[PDB]
Amino acid sequence: LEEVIEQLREANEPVPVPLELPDEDQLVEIEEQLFINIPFVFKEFLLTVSDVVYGSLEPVTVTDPQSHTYLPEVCATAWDLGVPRELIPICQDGEDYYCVEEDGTVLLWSALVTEESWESVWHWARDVWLES
């Protein structure tokens, strides 16, 4: 875990306006707004690397309501597009969405869910995000 986090943090790409990392209170606000419980490991991801910019994928964030990756807006768009309400998007990819199950499994929903999945958000970060 420490390994993957370090890899992402050190690979962070500079941008004009740096992204902000949320605190626990901010995550609670998002959960309440969506009336859902964010899986623990997913919450850990948001609290440790959601300020990171890297590769060709831009995962969800919770600190800038005007961002195209703002979780509440991404959820609304994904759920309206067909993503099961029980799945919380972690990263948009075109019209597809990498989403997280209540138990933490990451799935890929094709504009139904495909056959590929990742054991955790960290597996996804290491094997998909860091490989982009």
Residues whose CB falls within 8 Å of the CB of residue 96, separated by 6 or more in sequence, listed in order: 108, 109, 110, 111
Q: Does 117 bind Ca ion (CB under 5 A)?
A: no
Give the separation between CA 26 and CA 23, rounded to whole angstroms: 5
Least CB distance to Ca ion at residue 107 (A): 8
Q: Does 101 bind Ca ion (CB under 5 A)?
A: yes
Q: Does 103 bind Ca ion (CB under 5 A)?
A: yes
Number of residues in contact with Ca ion under rule CB under 5 A: 3
Exactly one of 34, 44, 105, 130 binds Ca ion (CB under 5 A); that residue is 105
Residue 13 CA neighbour count, 13 Å, CB half = 8
Least CB distance to Ca ion at residue 119 (A): 9
Contact 125, 4 (CB under 8 A): yes
Q: Is 25 annotated as a binding residue?
A: no
Judged by CB under 5 A, which stretch of 30-38, 58-66, 95-103, 122-130 contacts Ca ion?
95-103
Q: How many CB atoms lie within 10 A of CB 55?
A: 13
Q: Is 101 annotated as a binding residue?
A: yes
Strand ordering across the sheet containing 88-93 = 88-93, 96-100, 106-109, 113-118
Q: Which residues bind Ca ion (CB under 5 A)?
A: 101, 103, 105
Q: Binding-site residues for Ca(2+), please?
A: 101, 103, 105
